[PDB]
Amino acid sequence: STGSATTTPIDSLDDAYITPVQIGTPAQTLNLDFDTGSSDLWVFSSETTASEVXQTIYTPSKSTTAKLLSGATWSISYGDGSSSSGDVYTDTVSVGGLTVTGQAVESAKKVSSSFTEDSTIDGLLGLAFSTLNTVSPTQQKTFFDNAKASLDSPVFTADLGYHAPGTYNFGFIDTTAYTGSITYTAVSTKQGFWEWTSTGYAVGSGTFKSTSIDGIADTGTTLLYLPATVVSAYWAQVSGAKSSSSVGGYVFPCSATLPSFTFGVGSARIVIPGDYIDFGPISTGSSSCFGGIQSSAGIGINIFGDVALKAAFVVFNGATTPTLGFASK
Ligand SMILES: C[C@@H](O)[C@H](N)C(=O)O
């Protein structure tokens, strides 16, 4: 089997992407944030504290296929400090025509304020390794892990758009969706992430510096977070750019034409266009724009988030020894 689903930016800035997910019988369609940096499928629900719901909800009591996972609970927090918790059902879940039975659907009893405030995201669908799942006492498998037995190939691909719709595919590689060839690179699962080591970087039309950048491929992170020295080298080539303590990162004049940023994948190179690094105005009508490349020092891990991933066709190879593939597009 295969699946193919359209993923859409939630807003004009590409802050995140949503993908429709069908849960239960009859199907209840929710728009979920597909997150290769976490491993829980959790949803706003009929169980969620009413004052914390503003979203489409899952109602397990309206699904003939929902089963309570007795004694199971979950609780998650993300890098931005957001959180949610609740109880667990198994139910039928379909993405892009690919159906999994018995998927753990984590029903929120409570959600944090950032989730309430974002009307566009009805929950998360985690695609990191199942060792990061937060269900207790027994962790639950991701949608991808549950799908592998039936898939034509144990792979999924992310093709995120720059201010445009894109695609998540499960079970096949669309050879028309990328240019050149895919280069694969080793993954470490020791921390539960799609963690890999980039071979280095270049700024604009300058030299490629060979330097091991260990980081994660994270569709649930908006920006590209890289080592302080690398980020400084980038913004050194932008004459109006400065680090802003109050705004929380590098800012620059919106009128600037930014250099590209290239990262290494083995011998191959992925070029992020300069326009992708212009995240957006700090407020509507500002002359100042926020940078899409920021230091990872405060996070403690380098993150190839949407700014980077949307410049590539990315293959998440979930064979027993996983690998990550990148192609230009
Ligand atoms: C893995 C998930 O729990 C989250 N991204 C974290 O690392 O806190």
CATH of 174-328, one of 2.40.70.10, 1.10.3720.10, 2.60.40.10, 2.20.140.10: 2.40.70.10
Structural method? X-ray
Domain assignments of the chain as residue spans, ordered by start:
5-173, 174-328
Give the catalytic positions in this structure: 35, 198
CATH class of 5-173: mainly beta
User: Do β-strands 98-111 and 41-43 pair in parallel, antiparallel, or remain unpaired?
Assistant: parallel
The β-bridge partners of 86 are: 74, 108
Q: Which atom of ligand 1 is nearest to the CA of 79?
A: 8
Structure tokens at 119: 């009307």
Helix (H, G, I), strand (E, B) or coil at 277: helix
Q: Which atom of ligand 1 is nearest to the CA of 193?
A: 1
What CA–CA distance (Å, rounded) separates 138 from 162?
38
Q: What is the resolution of this structure in A?
A: 0.9
Q: Which atom of ligand 1 is nearest to the CA of 35?
A: 5
171's torsion region: left (phi>0), alpha (psi -120 to 50) or beta? left
What CA–CA distance (Å, rounded) separates 167 from 169?
6
CA 280, distance to chain mean position in Å, is: 19
What CA–CA distance (Å, rounded) separates 114 from 41?
18
Q: Which stretches does DSSP call E strand in 228-277?
A: 242-244, 249-253, 261-265, 268-272
What CA–CA distance (Å, rounded) separates 131 from 191?
9
Q: Probe ligand 1: pick from 34, 35, 36, 38, max atoms within 8 Å of CB?
A: 38
What CA–CA distance (Å, rounded) separates 6 from 18?
8
For the Cβ of 132 lying below 6 angstroms from any atom of ligand 1, the answer is: yes
What CA–CA distance (Å, rounded) separates 187 from 316?
10
What CA–CA distance (Å, rounded) separates 53 from 108?
10
User: Do β-strands 224-226 and 313-317 pair in parallel, antiparallel, or remain unpaired?
Assistant: unpaired
